[PDB]
A paper describes a structure:
Members of GH family 73 (GH73) are β-N-acetylglucosaminidases that cleave the β-1,4 glycosidic linkage between the N-acetylglucosamine (GlcNAc) and N-acetylmuramic acid (MurNAc) residues of bacterial cell wall peptidoglycan (PG). In some instances, GH73 enzymes are associated with bacterial pathogenicity, for example, LytB being critical for pneumococcal nasal colonization and cell division, Auto for pathogenic listeriosis caused by Listeria monocytogenes, and FlgJ for biogenesis and function of the flagellum, which is a major virulence factor of motile pathogenic bacteria. The domain was found to adopt a lysozyme-like fold common to other GH73 enzymes, which consists of an α-helical subdomain packed against a β-lobe that forms an extended β-hairpin motif. The α-helical domain and β-hairpin of StFlgJGH(151–316) together form a groove-shaped active site, with the α-helical subdomain containing an α-central helix that houses a conserved glutamate general acid/base (E184), and the β-hairpin, in turn, containing a second glutamate residue (E223) previously determined to be required for GH activity.
Next, we determined the crystal structure of the truncated GH domain (StFlgJGH(151–301)) to 2.2 Å resolution to study the active site of StFlgJ in the absence of the C-terminal α-helix. The asymmetric unit contained three copies of the truncated domain. Though the C-terminal α-helix no longer occupied the active site, the catalytic β-hairpin of each domain was found to partly occlude the active site of neighbouring domains in the crystal structure. While this crystal packing did not provide an unobstructed active site, it did impart significant structural order to the β-hairpin. The β-hairpin was found to be located further from the helical domain of the enzyme than any previously reported structure of a GH73 enzyme, including Auto and SpFlgJ. A superposition of StFlgJ with the structures of other GH73 enzymes reveals substantial differences in the position of the β-hairpin harboring the putative catalytic E223 residue. Removing the C-terminal α-helix, however, allowed us to determine a 2.1 Å crystal structure of the domain in which the extended β-hairpin, known to accommodate a second putative catalytic carboxyl group, was well ordered and revealed that the active site of StFlgJ seems capable of opening widely, possibly aiding in substrate capture and turnover. Contrary to our hypothesis, the assays revealed that the StFlgJ GH domain is fully active both with and without the C-terminal α-helix, indicating that the helix does not auto-inhibit StFlgJ GH activity and is likely not functionally equivalent to the N-terminal auto-inhibitory helix of Auto.
Residue numbers in the entry: 151 to 301
The structure:
Amino acid sequence: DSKDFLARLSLPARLASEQSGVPHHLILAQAALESGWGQRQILRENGEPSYNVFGVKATASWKGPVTEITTTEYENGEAKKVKAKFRVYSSYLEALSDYVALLTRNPRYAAVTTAATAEQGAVALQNAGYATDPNYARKLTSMIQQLKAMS
Ligand code: NA
């Protein structure tokens, strides 16, 4: 949505940035990229938001509410219905806090939480194997530049 995406996520991203040390525009850029500027929603079975902008799956460790999404595979001429549980967050703040908490709790991402710029962080992330793109930093860095042009 035409820069409303920032109006929605900018404050929670900043607060998570300040909690974790992860650069503000990095978080925002990852969200903007992995949700298509927020156009990809993961809604609960009743249409309500999950606020789960990174599409994080729900595990046994997750104690919160969840939503199940049904997709389909046409394999061996059979139509297999597969279900996937996603975390439901209270707010975009909980969503982004859940994300950076993970980052904080794993030394493989030390370089992100002490990065001086967003672009440095995007580089530290690529190293650590995030997204398993070896040219990940570049995808993200263009998005970051686009976020900064807006701020
Ligand atoms: Na944290």
